[PDB]
């Protein structure tokens, strides 16, 4: 075991089967290393840069890279890749917020039930975190025509795993479908450095200010739509070591690698609700028989990309459960088609057990409130008539629904002018009971549900209107006995 | 031995344990070296730049770096890191309207910065007036630590160019300035260089950019700030990654970190900066949420129950605010106004002696030596073996404070937050009462934010 | 020996002790070399550049550097450092400039000095780049005449030991507190060459016109009218140094002097010598106090002065181009920290001389030679002769004294003094009987009288007197004693210029 075909100081056999770096030397992987904290790395023995990034497999695995790079990008399959966008703080004035997911979720259709095996949803307008949508937070029904009777505050963000140096973004002013001009940061709106999961200017500093609109767009802006600001391209550099040991970011353009990484990877986005992450994971092309990129499943990709913890069987991200049945998976058309085609040949019927291919797009939307009756409950109020003396749950226990259960959801906790979906898993062994669900919202809707012998997922939509309004009431009425588990509420796009 | 994994001219065995530099070559540490002035250095044996700065462990330890770098940054665990800001001295508006301001750059780090080009924000109330970047006319060639540009004894430089003349667009914001508002100045980013010696021996600061190292240093270190009331120092000390078994960064406590970072002397047990006590009980410690949580979690597993014995961790933020007036009844008393009901015959103090109080203590503080319109706190430690007396405070301030405190069997610290407003207002009255006989020690007064 | 730790072509044993360069190679020092004119060099054996300048110890000692560098900087302990400032000599909406006014404005003169410390203390110690100009065109009229409700003439100067190439000063144009604008030479006010002790343009050339138009307020105009204290601050200067290359050519292109300014200022002590007309600024390297690995040699203050200013030691007293610059023959001015260090260090010395105190890092020293000084031994530069002088004595401070019994008068014409300037009259007196008394009278703009009592040994006394106008009464100084008194080393030193 001494061959090095790609010449990156890792033997072919070790890199094919499994290796780890100890004392700056690659060693064969042994299962006893897991408790000591070492991780099992695998990469391609024919290419020195498996993920397509500036750093080779040895440099990533051994940590011999910039120390500002996230520890997730030390896996050869996870690329070091900045994701820089621009978000609007104020416009001129009234305070506004921004969302990196609304454009992705605006085009998802929610149905009452889900088909066999497949659990996630399908979007028609999949977008990345660089697309940003503005939402006015200081609106009280007034229009923008008042006052005038007829600059801009921005703050760059990084959702990638690598820092970008000398950031020069280019953004388009989208007048709800119209473009004034393309604007490029000339000399004073350049960020010298922008670490992952941080903004420029840093938190605690005033939003950046950079140096007109017609009544037709004012009428559009006043009625139901808000301006959006998205980046067409960003130019920046990366750091590498000299022969004298210095770090240089000059001539090291990130644009030399944008196209290569994007074409050998699969895009995955995780949205915790407060902070958002976007990762690229390398995959192999199907036709080529000389492509030696390791093949891993979707759950392994999630664990490697987001450094989730495998506490038993379910993955946990900083304590938040991100398991297949605890989140809302959103794919585009092609990825959903591939997953559905691959699921019929798999007896497990799990999305996370499906092999990861290049070109797939996955979005994970973590619920705002989720309960599983085992260890996790973050609902603002406790559900009524909770039964836990059962051992027939989806994972550990379930809820023995016999009668009526209600939940009190204050309007203050939920963001106004937003679209939500209520989801959960239900099972009825007798297959002779009916479920009636009523949601109290701006519009009251009544829907009937027929559970099956095994666990199935249901979903119902509702919207919240107005900061000052009535509470939200959800009730579950059962004719007989119904098994309930893994109830959750996720936040979809905003509404006019 | 002679094994050098990282190739930085220090053997791995020497780095794992202590080592020191004698005659520009590394040697094993011996306890007899401390009496001759030599210092004990420990660093990671798997990396050449433990702290993340442009200088390796051997260069820092042996002093083979720029001589303008402070001696604190000669320790491999303390980073050589400039902290450059801008401070506004005068503000001028005149005629539309032309804005000129008088500023002066500051450096609170351990390394000089060359060719300083700061960027600062002009904000009056949330809204940024403009983003200003210095031009060739107002770039500082040299900015040494603990020094300003221009140096002391020179007039502050004026900033009135935006290459041009700066001019606000609308007048409503300028008119709102008179409506009880002010202009704020904060530093967004600063450009600059560091010196390295080339193959001919000359110092070069041309291709060397400090921005190539900001993200890396800020990511592998902990931030500590020491404020003595007159001059402020900000330091970065390297810490290890929690989940990495291959991270060989040495692990040190908070007191060791402070001693290394600020070159504080230690006479037996206490820590002195320049004769100013900076001990755990002699200053005010301020932490953010995460650092406070880590410290509280780690304290319950430690018998001594001291902040300075808690292991330093990556990402922690510590602020040390040295009290302006501090007395310990032993060797230091700069209080302008004497106390009441004082009996100095005791031996049950925190370090040497204490003060015997029987009843209540009230202090009338003259405000002549006090800076107007600043929040203050009066702090100290109290002892009560009986655990049967209650302590309450009667405080005269903007909002009158009446709170209750229960002394413990051992020494306990009392500090109550209050806001003082009005120079031409009523005198500040502070009253504290105890039911029985109590022992009090380490009394101090500290300025805070206003 | 042969060991060379720092790789600068001089053995460590040679650097720890003295050494000298003969035939471009270092040799061990011998006491007999002083006759041939050779000098004894010491440097740090762990450092190539002891002084912190771009030139190593061997390059400095062997003289293999730019030939425009003064022989003072041939010593490895004396840094090759340019001190470039801007001076103004013409006002446009005829003028002299003093480079040691900010230092002497804050010095307070007292009659008596504590035993051992025969020096003064300043409050606003500044360097020769901080320059103040005094207008002499006005004879009593204000600037408001003629115009009521932009290009000035300047000339750079160098008081260092190294030439500056491609000089680009950044002068701070501050009138009184308020800074109107900060300006910097761009293309036509850049000096290609500026040798030490030289100006740009040269002495026989007209001053260059300073660079659009800057508004001037009116209140500051009458502020100048009340008192003329216009200042011309130089915040920074850009320039290059010359070094040889592989071809053998002198190169001054990427050789920025700013790469070395912070390093030199951090490992050295600043000393300024003012010789009445010309002013010199030097930097001498010193050691770190708490560093066992710092091998910089330790020298005293007198040794540092002799090394830095190339003074000649004629016996035991230092001489600078004939002018005596000994401790008792000049006016030493320190700042607070240097003064307290010297005061602490004197009480552990038997001799109790400032020149015997070890030089330390961060020290600031200013030397101002008196305008008129006599010692009754060989030097007497007063325009007139002191009356009632008894040269035949042996109890003098160095050789002889002035046996005083009665009254002493000196005539001093006003044309020999610069008007509107604060002055100091100083000397040493001693009375073995410890019973007589001395009274003095100074005839100046104010009639001031002070009393003085001598001691068993010599004790310096200092008194103030000012001048006003070019046409006024002559300055008369009276020395009156009851019994017999010994006087020696009488001097008059010119301090700052008083406001109009
Ligand atoms: Ca390989
Ligand atoms: Ca490979
Ligand atoms: Ca469950
Ligand atoms: Ca090593
Ligand atoms: Ca090391
Ligand atoms: Ca005590
Ligand atoms: Ca040598
Ligand atoms: Ca040497
Ligand atoms: Ca004499």
From TrEMBL, chain A:
The keyword Calcium applies. This is Iota toxin component Ib. It comes from Clostridium perfringens. Ca(2+) 2 binds at residues 6, 8, 15, 44, 47, 57. GO terms for biological process: protein homooligomerization. The keyword Chaperone does not apply. Ca(2+) 3 binds at residues 372, 374, 395-397, 485. The lineage of its organism: Bacteria, Bacillati, Bacillota, Clostridia, Eubacteriales. One of its GO terms (cellular component) is extracellular region. Keywords: Calcium, Metal-binding, Signal. It comes from the Bacteria.
UniProtKB/TrEMBL annotation, chain B:
One of its GO terms (cellular component) is extracellular region. GO terms for biological process: protein homooligomerization. Ca(2+) 2 binds at residues 6, 8, 15, 44, 47, 57. Ca(2+) 3 binds at residues 328, 330, 351-353, 441. Coiled coil: none annotated. The keyword Signal applies. It comes from Clostridium perfringens. This is Iota toxin component Ib. Ca(2+) 1 binds at residues 4, 6, 8, 10, 12, 15. It comes from the Bacteria. Keywords: Calcium, Metal-binding, Signal. The chain holds residues 216 to 742 of 875 of the full protein.
């Amino acid at each position: 075991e001494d061959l090095d075909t790609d010449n990156d100081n890792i033997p072919d056999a070790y890199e094919k089967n499994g290796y780890t770096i100890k004392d700056s030397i690659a060693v064969k992987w042994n299962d006893s290393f897991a408790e000591q904290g070492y991780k099992k790395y695998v990469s391609s023995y024919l290419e020195s840069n498996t993920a397509g990034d500036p750093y080779t497999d040895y440099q990533k695995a051994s940590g011999s890279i910039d120390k500002a790079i996230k520890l997730e990008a030390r896996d050869p399959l996870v690329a070091a890749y900045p994701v820089v966008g621009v978000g609007m703080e104020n416009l001129i004035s009234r305070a506004t917020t921004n969302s990196k997911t609304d454009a992705n979720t605006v085009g998802v259709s929610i149905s009452a039930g889900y088909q066999n095996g497949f659990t996630g949803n399908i979007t028609t307008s999949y977008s990345h975190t660089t697309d940003n949508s503005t939402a006015v937070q200081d609106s009280n029904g007034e229009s923008w025509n008042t006052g005038l009777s007829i600059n801009a505050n921005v703050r760059y963000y990084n959702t990638g795993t690598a820092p970008m140096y000398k950031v020069t973004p280019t953004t388009n002013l989208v007048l709800d479908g119209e473009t004034l001009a393309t604007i490029k940061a000339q000399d004073n709106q350049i960020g010298n450095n922008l670490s992952p999961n941080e903004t420029y200017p840093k938190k605690g500093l005033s939003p950046l200010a950079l140096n007109p609109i017609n009544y037709d767009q004012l009428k559009k802006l006043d009625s139901g739509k808000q301006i959006k600001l998205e980046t067409t391209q960003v130019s920046g550099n990366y750091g590498t070591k000299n022969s004298q040991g210095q770090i240089i970011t000059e001539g090291n353009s990130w644009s030399n690698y944008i196209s290569q990484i994007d074409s050998v990877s699969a895009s995955i986005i995780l949205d915790t609700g407060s902070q958002t992450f976007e990762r690229r994971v390398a995959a192999k092309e199907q036709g080529n028989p000389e492509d030696k990129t390791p093949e891993i499943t979707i759950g392994e990709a999630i664990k490697k990309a987001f450094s989730a913890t495998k506490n038993g069987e379910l993955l946990y991200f900083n304590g938040i459960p991100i398991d297949e049945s605890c989140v809302e998976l959103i794919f585009d058309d092609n990825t959903s088609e591939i997953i559905k085609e691959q699921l019929k040949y798999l007896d497990d019927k799990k999305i996370y057990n499906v092999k990861l291919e290049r070109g797939m797009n996955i979005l994970i939307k973590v619920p705002s409130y989720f309960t599983n009756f085992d260890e996790y409950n973050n609902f603002p109020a406790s559900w009524s008539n909770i039964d836990t003396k059962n051992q027939d749950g989806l994972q550990s226990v379930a809820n023995k629904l016999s009668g009526e259960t209600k939940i009190i959801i204050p309007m203050s906790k939920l963001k106004p002018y937003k679209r939500y979906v209520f989801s959960g898993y239900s099972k009825d062994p007798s297959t002779s009971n009916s479920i009636t669900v009523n949601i109290k919202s701006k519009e009251q809707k009544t829907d009937y549900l027929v559970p099956e012998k095994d666990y199935t997922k249901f979903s119902y939509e509702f919207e919240t209107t107005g900061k000052d309004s009535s509470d939200i009431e959800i009730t579950l009425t059962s004719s007989g006995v119904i098994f309930l588990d893994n109830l959750s509420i996720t936040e979809l796009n905003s509404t006019p």
